[PDB]
Design a protein around this ligand. Structure first.
Ligand SMILES: [Cl-]
Ligand SMILES: [Cl-]
Ligand SMILES: [Co+2]
Ligand SMILES: [Mg+2]
Ligand SMILES: [Mg+2]
Ligand SMILES: [Mg+2]
Length: 309
């Protein structure tokens, strides 16, 4: 009775083992192999955050729990998850070819990043669709953004409320909430890319829901292309706000990220923590969504809304 549909779950990708780091960052750096000192530094960072292998496992669990949950909560469609990644196998093109090979004719896609950008989401969506077109007989409907899904907002609102409630009274009245996403080159503005506006809306929605009146928006994890990247960076922002108003606690919500990956476990929990430690402020960073049931239900809702179900 049920209609079969592919569920294409797309993400940046993460290395699967230490020996993957070289090829992974080469791919990110557009063919430019990192120098030996950069490779060793990267290996050290991954060791510092508890190792590499749990990273890719999170994406796999998110895709599979999403598949199973979608299949449980409605009775019209049977979904089959396929993971397509940007910077490591299985690549996006590989996943589409496999759906096509398995006889899938209709699919829905979603990127594991809630905010639309021309650089990331649009590019993944275009690549998926071009491959489907090249093969023929397979169509894909693509989710473009989902930062504004109530259930996803609620996830972060609830985590923020819990954090502020755990604070001693003096920190609670002198805390600052920093809401962030991965920086992109500023030149996306040339196309009217709504990515920065969507991060600001994410921050508004989360702060409002949590009852937090003092918050700011920052960016993190900028690459090293020559042209300017979106700022301010979370490290500079933290220090600027501290020098400005003397906050005693900083709460970091990297809403652009969905998992315990390097850019959270290192770029927040180490790099921002260095700054808060230096200024004598408390550091808080609530749990990332990962594959938790509340997050999986939000993602399932997004997918079913996109399909008009
Ligand atoms: Cl959409
Ligand atoms: Cl959008
Ligand atoms: Co990055
Ligand atoms: Mg080894
Ligand atoms: Mg929308
Ligand atoms: Mg960095």
């Amino acid at each position: 009775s049920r209609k079969k549909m592919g569920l294409l779950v797309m993400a940046y990708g993460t290395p699967y083992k230490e020996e993957d780091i070289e090829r992974y960052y080469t791919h990110i750096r557009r063919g430019r192999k990192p120098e030996p000192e950069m490779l060793q530094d990267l290996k050290d960072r991954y060791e510092a955050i508890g190792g590499i292998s749990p990273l890719a496992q999170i994406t796999e669990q998110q895709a599979h729990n999403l598949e199973q949950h979608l299949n449980e909560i409605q009775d019209e469609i049977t979904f089959k998850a396929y993971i397509g990644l940007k910077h490591i196998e299985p690549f996006i093109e590989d996943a589409v070819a496999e759906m096509h090979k398995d006889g899938i004719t209709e699919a829905v896609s979603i990127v594991l990043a809630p905010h639309f950008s021309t650089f990331s989401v649009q590019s993944y969506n275009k690549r998926a669709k071009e491959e489907a077109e090249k093969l023929g007989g397979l169509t894909i409907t693509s989710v473009e953004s989902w930062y504004d899904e109530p259930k996803f907002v609620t996830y972060w609102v609830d985590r923020v409320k819990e954090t502020y409630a755990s604070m001693p009274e003096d920190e609670r009245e002198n805390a600052m909430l920093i809401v962030s996403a991965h920086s992109l080159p500023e030149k996306i503005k040339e196309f009217g890319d709504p990515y920065p506006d969507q991060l600001h809306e994410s921050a508004k929605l989360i702060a409002e829901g949590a009852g937090v009146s003092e918050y700011a928006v920052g960016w993190q994890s900028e690459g090293n292309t020559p042209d300017p990247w979106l700022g301010p960076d979370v490290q500079d922002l933290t220090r600027d706000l501290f020098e400005q108003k003397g906050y005693q606690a900083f709460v970091y919500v990297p809403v652009g990220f969905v998992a315990d990956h390097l850019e959270v476990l290192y770029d927040n929990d180490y790099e921002c923590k260095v700054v808060t430690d230096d200024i004598g402020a408390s550091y808080y960073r609530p749990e990332m969504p990962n594959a938790k049931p509340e997050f999986i239900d939000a993602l399932a809702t997004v997918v079913l809304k996109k399909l008009g179900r």
